[PDB]
Amino acid sequence: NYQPTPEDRFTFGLWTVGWQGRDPFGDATRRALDPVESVRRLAELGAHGVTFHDDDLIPFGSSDSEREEHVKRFRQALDDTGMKVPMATTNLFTHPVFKDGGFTANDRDVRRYALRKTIRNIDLAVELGAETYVAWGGREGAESGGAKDVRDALDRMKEAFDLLGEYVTSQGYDIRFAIEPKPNEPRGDILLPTVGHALAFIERLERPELYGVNPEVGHEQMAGLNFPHGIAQALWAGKLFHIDLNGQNGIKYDQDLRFGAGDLRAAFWLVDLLESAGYSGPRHFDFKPPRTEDFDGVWASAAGCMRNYLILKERAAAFRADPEVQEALRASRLDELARPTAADGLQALLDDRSAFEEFDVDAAAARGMAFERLDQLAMDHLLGAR
Amino acid sequence: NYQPTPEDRFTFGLWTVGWQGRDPFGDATRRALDPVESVRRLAELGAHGVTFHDDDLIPFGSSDSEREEHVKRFRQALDDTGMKVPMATTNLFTHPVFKDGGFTANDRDVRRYALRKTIRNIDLAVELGAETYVAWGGREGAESGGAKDVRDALDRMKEAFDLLGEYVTSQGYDIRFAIEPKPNEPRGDILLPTVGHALAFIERLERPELYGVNPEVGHEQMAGLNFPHGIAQALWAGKLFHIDLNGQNGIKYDQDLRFGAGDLRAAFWLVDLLESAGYSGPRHFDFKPPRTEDFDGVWASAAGCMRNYLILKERAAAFRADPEVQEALRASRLDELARPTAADGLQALLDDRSAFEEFDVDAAAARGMAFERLDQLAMDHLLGAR
Amino acid sequence: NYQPTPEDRFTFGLWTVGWQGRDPFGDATRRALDPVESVRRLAELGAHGVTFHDDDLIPFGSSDSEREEHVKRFRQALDDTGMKVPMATTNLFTHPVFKDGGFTANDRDVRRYALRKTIRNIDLAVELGAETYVAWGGREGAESGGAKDVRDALDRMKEAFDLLGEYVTSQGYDIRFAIEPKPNEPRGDILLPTVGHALAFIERLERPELYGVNPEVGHEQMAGLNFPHGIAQALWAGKLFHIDLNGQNGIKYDQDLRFGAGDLRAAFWLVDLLESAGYSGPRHFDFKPPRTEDFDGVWASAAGCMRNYLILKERAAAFRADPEVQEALRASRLDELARPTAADGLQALLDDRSAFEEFDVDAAAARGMAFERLDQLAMDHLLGAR
Amino acid sequence: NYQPTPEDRFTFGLWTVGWQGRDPFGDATRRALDPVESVRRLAELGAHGVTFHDDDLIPFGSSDSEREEHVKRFRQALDDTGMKVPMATTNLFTHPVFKDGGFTANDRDVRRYALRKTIRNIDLAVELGAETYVAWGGREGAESGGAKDVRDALDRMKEAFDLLGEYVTSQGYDIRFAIEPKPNEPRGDILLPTVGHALAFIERLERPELYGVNPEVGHEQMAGLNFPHGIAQALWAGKLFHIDLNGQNGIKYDQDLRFGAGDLRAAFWLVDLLESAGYSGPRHFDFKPPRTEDFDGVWASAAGCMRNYLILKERAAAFRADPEVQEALRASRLDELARPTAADGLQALLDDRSAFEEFDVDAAAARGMAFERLDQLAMDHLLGAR
Ligand SMILES: [Mg+2]
Ligand SMILES: [Mg+2]
Ligand SMILES: [Mg+2]
Ligand SMILES: [Mg+2]
Ligand SMILES: [Mg+2]
Ligand SMILES: [Mg+2]
Ligand SMILES: [Mg+2]
Ligand SMILES: [Mg+2]
């Protein structure tokens, strides 16, 4: 009954089930988890792997000796469980030194420190087998207009990512980068605030083939945008390297609810798209078990992430396989949308009187699209009413 | 006292001062304006030029004979006034045939009609001297998830813009295209919903140098985004071909208030950016005089657009010229943001112990950014308190 | 299979299935419906009744002779079908004279006209058997700060509703009033923008027992608010006289999607609440079939409204009846929320050392709320996974 | 030059300038302030007084002996400076025991503890001379639908406030209560989310005259609402007991920017309203100096709060005193809005043929409202262009 196995490629950040519940108005409600116990308990739930910030695994300020011991314990738990580490990232947001950013801090010495901190963790990520390295520029931005010249900041952001690309290629590493956009919080406005801005920025890097996006459900919804649409544009560009799954109830603070919570129909259309398009990367959950919960509630919430994905996968597959839906898709001319507008070419289009001079605009306008019948079939399938 | 002249390059759409006031819940409150009278009255206010949709100038369904007469009258009013036509666009949204889009309608014959309607107006735009041709895909999108396969739709959108680029190059025309993004309304979600998504899409076209963006103040604010930040990214990419100026009070329906209304401090930072960066294109107002107004209120609202730009231009110039502000910018290290992070190169950065091993993180973290004093100087200048 | 009957009390506005599809950017895509054909076709779908604005039934400007004929035809269709008319309302928004409002227009003669237009339709509503008279003040508000002194406007709004209450009581009519809130559109901001503001205003009227609210799903969601929470507060106050059901995708223009579209989980919790609380008024749909649709799509969309209510009603009933859910509700202490905090009284609470001096705060804080397990049971029931 | 004095009644929370900068993603960037030093430094800036949560002044868990010493030190600093304490409040949100609320926690023993913690601080507030006691129910709400039966929760909320009212009246205290609404954060949805919901709730309390609202600029703007409109409704009801001034950039997390930042024109219309209506309570700033700042930036930000109020007060006064504005207000019929619609009474209105039968609707509809000219005069005054 909707039981995950490692073959489903579900992954979790250490910082997700490990969130202690400290929010802007309250103290932690849960004790800290040992990364080793998180790995074991996620493996028992059927997860495929875990992800980490450098500072989740190795406490900030650790000596190289303490560092080696933290990694060894972690690697033993991976060996004991069969868990993988497909992605890693850098914490460039918690320490006060990053209060005006890492790669785009106004202070030059902070920007250089941010790069060295990142490079050190790229080496570790490669050692643990990660294929994707995520960057979330949570402190890159501003609360006021004069604090940040955004053209200069984008120069500094391009400089940093170009240097990281030079580093991985000079080392011969087989790892790619994914930018994770967010429109705001903790900064008043964050640079590269949506999937679109991130995709555009990547095309100005020196080696664009090394960079893609890591979109998050809740972040695009914090701008009121359609998350499945943004994912479709990322897939269209060949840039969906990784994805963060969770839930969000509209335009407000970043809730990071378990996947399936928040906008349920958007979750359905997202799963439909990922499965139809053959996305084969990790299904990663960047979520926070609410601070109302004890540890039993933490693992229930994590299990719910995977359960809801598998239910939605079944409903989307039934929808697409239903002969009545296939008929309705043709009634709404989805087949015609997939056919070229003018494969006959520009001159033939210009000479085609049926395209303008003799086109019956009123008869075309009278044709209903039949979208509402199609959408109610989708609703019936989602709710198990068919 | 803040009087515009044609040298300020202020332009207006025919559809702006000509809006009759018909909204989703009410009938028109003003009679239709003759395009000739709009041109004369805008010239008297100090405007530089006007812009048009094909259907604003030539009523839909006109014979080629009626078409020639409408253009001749219009050209005589331009000659009489000295007004220019720097931009033109196509109406692919009003007629019922476009109810599921123009370039991305599911019906193939509608997509072909949309292209022919566009090409006809490009010829006219070139004849009238327009340098920019805008595309606003207001009907390209969906209210429901199954109605539109977005990857197929982006294929169709790329096909349409590639064909338009082939047409202008084969004709030898000196005109460029600008995509105008909007996140929603009238469709539930619109394709290419922000500046960022539009910039990313342009990089996949066959001749990207022919295409830029025409961002609108209110549209980015309908997604809660920072409009000056988005303009900075457009300028950074070299793609700000045109701009639509107006006002918007937050995340709601597209208000198209006069420029300076809505988010006043965003208007200040926008003018600061455009003038600092040396933007030399038209200052175009895409606004609607509220339907509460009679025709005297229409011209007062239009005059207010230009007045507010000129006041903000004066305040932003005083801000940047103030020695106390220049000192505050250095106190906040804006000078350091403009300096390369690592012009010494990757290897030197890796060997630089002052960047990591010996970096004093606590001393750097203790340095205040002094952003609040800088922002209050900006407030004082905006309000004329200094 | 989820077939409605008149006993389910589903009702529709004439203006809903009759919407011709004219939006701010496009012309109508459907011909006008005769109110008589709408009544017949809704009765065949299983509706219980219809509602109307005065101007939906009687074209504006009709002579008393034409008026009598329009009513007679309508009443014959009601007799032929068994359809009821449980609610009626006034159009105080379409005609240009109402461009600055009806009850709160700055012009005094317009306010007097608005009252007389309303009173005439109250008489007709009573004649047709309506029990609720709705007021939606769509033009009451402002686009700018100086246009409307809101204290004076609330005086005028109270004056108008007090006069309507004096009229119905002096005539001996058995009808009550319901205010329908909306935060914005078509005005930049609308007075009494949410359920809460409307409830507060009612308490200042001379006969508060005559007035309640008619909340609409999409309108509270245009302010990002939780619609089931607002309905609970309306029920708590005894003021839920009527309700408008539809769908909305977040904070944007008023979409009026069919019920069940938009925020599906909010629709589930709404139906759970209405059925648990024993709401016995009409289940009214204030929705617009998208303008992509022809008339077959109109009736499919209307049928979908009722279908989705009945599916959600079944799932919510299964949820509440599940012994495992009843156990989970006790695990989350919903039973304790329903018990008085201090029925022993103030002095006993002050003397109770177990409430403060000897209260074990750390042991209470450690108790998990078990909300995530409860919410996944609710998800499983909604999706038919249990 | 815009220098505050204690007569301006500017007040600050201890938690405002004392905010250490810990946000959901980062550690504190500033050391804790001693309440005594905050009082001294605010007095030097020209503040009138300070406000406090119990836990700001007395560390949680203090013995009665430590408690007495903390109060004595504080009172000496008040005596040394002349600073007043006009308002106090309870922290029912930081400690983990309040993770599901205080007054509406599902656990009954937590609700009783919350009341006793509140009552203890009411005694202290009265001893320090506070006239208003604020309640912000930041933890009262839910992330999921089944966690909280909102009707039961409102019963518990009414029970708690009724008991507090019984306590103050039985003690003979001269203090009143003010509810501070917020729509969300830290809970997914918070009960009584806007000014309107709070005003409505107060009318169901046993002694409504003891309770009013404490609205906050940023909180109403987190729902996209018009803050001056909401304040006008609060003043109209006689319930504006206190106010929280700050800034917010649209619908996102609660920014608590300094007053004047965020929506500048809303700040102008707010000051215009408060000064016109003769509001005589404290001008309280509930703001957070951004965590980018050091302590010099903290005091600059606090000074900016008061400076911006005084600049806006001067501009609003000049606006209202301008003969040209007074003429424009009459041109827009603001004088007519203040006159009764029908002081002649219902029967005279019904018999008045000029109100309907002989009303010239087309001539009334043709009258422009002249709102745009009025609003540009307001803009000119705000910017010092007149
Ligand atoms: Mg997130
Ligand atoms: Mg993430
Ligand atoms: Mg617009
Ligand atoms: Mg535009
Ligand atoms: Mg609606
Ligand atoms: Mg409605
Ligand atoms: Mg706040
Ligand atoms: Mg506050």
mmCIF file of N, CA and C in Angstrom, chain C residues 315-348:
data_model
loop_
_atom_site.group_PDB
_atom_site.id
_atom_site.type_symbol
_atom_site.label_atom_id
_atom_site.label_comp_id
_atom_site.label_asym_id
_atom_site.label_seq_id
_atom_site.Cartn_x
_atom_site.Cartn_y
_atom_site.Cartn_z
ATOM 1 N N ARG C 315 -16.173 12.114 1.225
ATOM 2 C CA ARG C 315 -14.851 11.909 1.816
ATOM 3 C C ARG C 315 -14.773 12.490 3.222
ATOM 4 N N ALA C 316 -15.382 13.659 3.444
ATOM 5 C CA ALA C 316 -15.350 14.248 4.783
ATOM 6 C C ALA C 316 -16.143 13.400 5.766
ATOM 7 N N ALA C 317 -17.272 12.846 5.320
ATOM 8 C CA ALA C 317 -18.060 11.987 6.199
ATOM 9 C C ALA C 317 -17.305 10.707 6.544
ATOM 10 N N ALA C 318 -16.588 10.133 5.571
ATOM 11 C CA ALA C 318 -15.806 8.932 5.845
ATOM 12 C C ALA C 318 -14.683 9.237 6.822
ATOM 13 N N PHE C 319 -14.046 10.400 6.657
ATOM 14 C CA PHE C 319 -12.993 10.835 7.567
ATOM 15 C C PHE C 319 -13.502 10.905 9.005
ATOM 16 N N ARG C 320 -14.638 11.566 9.219
ATOM 17 C CA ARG C 320 -15.106 11.783 10.580
ATOM 18 C C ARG C 320 -15.620 10.501 11.215
ATOM 19 N N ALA C 321 -16.061 9.545 10.400
ATOM 20 C CA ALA C 321 -16.630 8.295 10.886
ATOM 21 C C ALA C 321 -15.589 7.215 11.132
ATOM 22 N N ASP C 322 -14.372 7.402 10.641
ATOM 23 C CA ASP C 322 -13.298 6.412 10.753
ATOM 24 C C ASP C 322 -12.861 6.277 12.206
ATOM 25 N N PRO C 323 -13.006 5.104 12.835
ATOM 26 C CA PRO C 323 -12.522 4.956 14.221
ATOM 27 C C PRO C 323 -11.062 5.349 14.409
ATOM 28 N N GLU C 324 -10.224 5.146 13.389
ATOM 29 C CA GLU C 324 -8.817 5.496 13.499
ATOM 30 C C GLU C 324 -8.632 7.006 13.545
ATOM 31 N N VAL C 325 -9.491 7.743 12.841
ATOM 32 C CA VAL C 325 -9.454 9.203 12.914
ATOM 33 C C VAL C 325 -9.958 9.681 14.268
ATOM 34 N N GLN C 326 -11.025 9.059 14.782
ATOM 35 C CA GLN C 326 -11.538 9.453 16.092
ATOM 36 C C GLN C 326 -10.481 9.252 17.170
ATOM 37 N N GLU C 327 -9.725 8.156 17.079
ATOM 38 C CA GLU C 327 -8.601 7.937 17.984
ATOM 39 C C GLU C 327 -7.540 9.021 17.816
ATOM 40 N N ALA C 328 -7.241 9.394 16.569
ATOM 41 C CA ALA C 328 -6.206 10.395 16.313
ATOM 42 C C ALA C 328 -6.624 11.771 16.811
ATOM 43 N N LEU C 329 -7.918 12.092 16.711
ATOM 44 C CA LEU C 329 -8.413 13.357 17.250
ATOM 45 C C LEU C 329 -8.211 13.419 18.758
ATOM 46 N N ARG C 330 -8.437 12.306 19.453
ATOM 47 C CA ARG C 330 -8.160 12.294 20.885
ATOM 48 C C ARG C 330 -6.665 12.355 21.163
ATOM 49 N N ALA C 331 -5.848 11.738 20.304
ATOM 50 C CA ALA C 331 -4.401 11.808 20.490
ATOM 51 C C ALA C 331 -3.885 13.236 20.355
ATOM 52 N N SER C 332 -4.551 14.056 19.540
ATOM 53 C CA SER C 332 -4.196 15.457 19.331
ATOM 54 C C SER C 332 -4.941 16.399 20.269
ATOM 55 N N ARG C 333 -5.743 15.847 21.183
ATOM 56 C CA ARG C 333 -6.459 16.578 22.231
ATOM 57 C C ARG C 333 -7.509 17.541 21.681
ATOM 58 N N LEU C 334 -8.127 17.207 20.543
ATOM 59 C CA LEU C 334 -9.291 17.987 20.113
ATOM 60 C C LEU C 334 -10.429 17.908 21.129
ATOM 61 N N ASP C 335 -10.546 16.786 21.855
ATOM 62 C CA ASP C 335 -11.561 16.707 22.900
ATOM 63 C C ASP C 335 -11.295 17.736 23.993
ATOM 64 N N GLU C 336 -10.021 17.953 24.338
ATOM 65 C CA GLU C 336 -9.700 18.897 25.404
ATOM 66 C C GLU C 336 -9.922 20.340 24.965
ATOM 67 N N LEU C 337 -9.744 20.635 23.675
ATOM 68 C CA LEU C 337 -10.026 21.983 23.185
ATOM 69 C C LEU C 337 -11.485 22.366 23.407
ATOM 70 N N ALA C 338 -12.391 21.382 23.365
ATOM 71 C CA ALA C 338 -13.818 21.643 23.532
ATOM 72 C C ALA C 338 -14.238 21.774 24.989
ATOM 73 N N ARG C 339 -13.341 21.508 25.930
ATOM 74 C CA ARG C 339 -13.679 21.618 27.343
ATOM 75 C C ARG C 339 -13.268 22.984 27.887
ATOM 76 N N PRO C 340 -14.105 23.593 28.730
ATOM 77 C CA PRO C 340 -13.777 24.913 29.288
ATOM 78 C C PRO C 340 -12.415 24.936 29.965
ATOM 79 N N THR C 341 -11.727 26.061 29.792
ATOM 80 C CA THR C 341 -10.435 26.266 30.432
ATOM 81 C C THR C 341 -10.577 26.368 31.941
ATOM 82 N N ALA C 342 -11.623 27.039 32.409
ATOM 83 C CA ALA C 342 -11.726 27.371 33.826
ATOM 84 C C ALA C 342 -13.193 27.497 34.228
ATOM 85 N N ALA C 343 -13.950 26.410 34.067
ATOM 86 C CA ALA C 343 -15.325 26.423 34.558
ATOM 87 C C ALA C 343 -15.374 26.546 36.073
ATOM 88 N N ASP C 344 -14.260 26.270 36.757
ATOM 89 C CA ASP C 344 -14.190 26.447 38.201
ATOM 90 C C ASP C 344 -14.134 27.917 38.600
ATOM 91 N N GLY C 345 -13.880 28.816 37.656
ATOM 92 C CA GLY C 345 -13.986 30.241 37.887
ATOM 93 C C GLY C 345 -12.643 30.884 38.179
ATOM 94 N N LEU C 346 -12.668 32.220 38.206
ATOM 95 C CA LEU C 346 -11.439 33.002 38.303
ATOM 96 C C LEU C 346 -10.709 32.753 39.618
ATOM 97 N N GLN C 347 -11.427 32.796 40.742
ATOM 98 C CA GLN C 347 -10.745 32.650 42.025
ATOM 99 C C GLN C 347 -10.105 31.274 42.158
ATOM 100 N N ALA C 348 -10.803 30.230 41.710
ATOM 101 C CA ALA C 348 -10.239 28.887 41.785
ATOM 102 C C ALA C 348 -9.000 28.771 40.911
#
